[PDB]
Amino acid sequence: DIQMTQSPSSVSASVGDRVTITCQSSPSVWSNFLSWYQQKPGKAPKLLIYEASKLTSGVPSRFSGSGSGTDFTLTISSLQPEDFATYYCGGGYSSISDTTFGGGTKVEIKRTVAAPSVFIFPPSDEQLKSGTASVVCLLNNFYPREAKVQWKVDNALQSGNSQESVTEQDSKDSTYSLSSTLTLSKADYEKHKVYACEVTHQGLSSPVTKSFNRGE
């Protein structure tokens, strides 16, 4: 069919760096019908460039597009932390019904290491009434995204009974936040005393531990 190939699928760059995204379509798009959109998490796409190179109003001069036919490039001159987003290309093909978008390029920011602030939360009494216990461990405002969170119940290393969740990159400081939730049945929760959360991350010399004794 049309085949709209956008690369890279994702990329990390330091603020101030130049980012280059290319979009290659098999059928040469119709007379210059190529556009670029920016989409930040949760928000809708935003038109940055159309006609392959015209910037819409209010778009920073650090954005610019070039190319023609089957090969185009979107270039971000000086990457800012606010540019974190997924970029998409759009193409027309004298069929209208063939309008297609590329797969997108997730552009993330590379900043210096920042250690996480760790907190732990025991399950509430209201939830204990329902027959289930959820223990929550919060890793706040850190970078890089990679982090290892391990649950230890009375030292017994848990495995297969917790889920993690990561926030999108912060557009101001470029950091992340992660939550790890240990979920047990009430009987199993009351079967132990010490619930601990152990975090390993590039910003910490030694892994940090957060815990609480059930009851007291």
Binding site: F33, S35, E51, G103, E126, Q127, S134, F212
Partner: protein, 222 residues
């Protein structure tokens, strides 16, 4: 001051129908061409079709059949009629305007917030809201952290708010995650200064429209 607002989104059973509406405020619109673009969760943008100033409509080859666009200028509203929905049609549907002066060209300048449509055979489920209370030693340290755990709901979305909007700084509402139950769950946390505790009240406001579930939980340390 100029925005497009979509509506009609929600839970639909497979094979059911649904009509989304796009209403503009701040401009006429009867003179602009409107497009509907969709995006499955975590996936990319997919064009569905367009309707010109004149009723004329064009559809993506795969949509011409179960999708129909129409407009009512006396109301300044565009409509998307979805028929025989498939689980695959679960997505955020967007309303977007073609740059005035173009047609057929994939240049869309004005978008709507987008409204999520979930095609599923499952019934809606309301969430439980438990507080995540800061530690008793939350005094001193480097500010305290507290939050809300919104557990077991379906489908998305769920919006969480702190102190009816007053508190926005240091707020992190995590992306929802599926549980072995097939239900979503998430938590919204917020870091505040130790001294604020006890003197300042903290309440998270959870709203899950699909189940008409609204809850205000006051998080308190013990």
């Amino acid at each position: 001051e100029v925005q497009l607002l979509e509506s009609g989104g929600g839970l639909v059973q497979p094979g059911g129908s649904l009509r989304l509406s796009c209403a503009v405020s701040g401009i006429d619109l009867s003179n602009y061409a409107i497009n509907w673009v969709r995006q499955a969760p975590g996936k990319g943008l997919e064009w569905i079709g367009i309707i010109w100033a004149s009723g004329t409509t064009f559809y993506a080859t795969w949509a011409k059949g179960r999708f129909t666009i129409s407009r009512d200028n006396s109301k300044n509203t565009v409509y998307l009629q979805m028929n025989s929905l498939r689980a695959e049609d679960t997505a955020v549907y967007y309303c977007a305007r073609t740059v005035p002066g173009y047609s057929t060209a994939p240049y869309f300048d004005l978008w709507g917030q987008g409204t999520l449509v979930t095609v599923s055979s499952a019934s809606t489920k309301g969430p439980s809201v438990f507080p995540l209370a800061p530690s008793s030693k939350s005094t001193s340290g480097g500010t305290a952290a507290l939050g809300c755990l919104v557990k077991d709901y379906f489908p998305e979305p769920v919006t969480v708010s702190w102190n009816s909007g007053a508190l926005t700084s240091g707020v992190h509402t995590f992306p929802a995650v599926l549980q072995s139950s097939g239900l979503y769950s998430l938590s919204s946390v917020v870091t505040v200064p130790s001294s604020s505790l006890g003197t300042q009240t903290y309440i998270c406001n959870v709203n899950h429209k699909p189940s008409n579930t609204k809850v205000d939980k006051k998080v308190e340390p013990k």
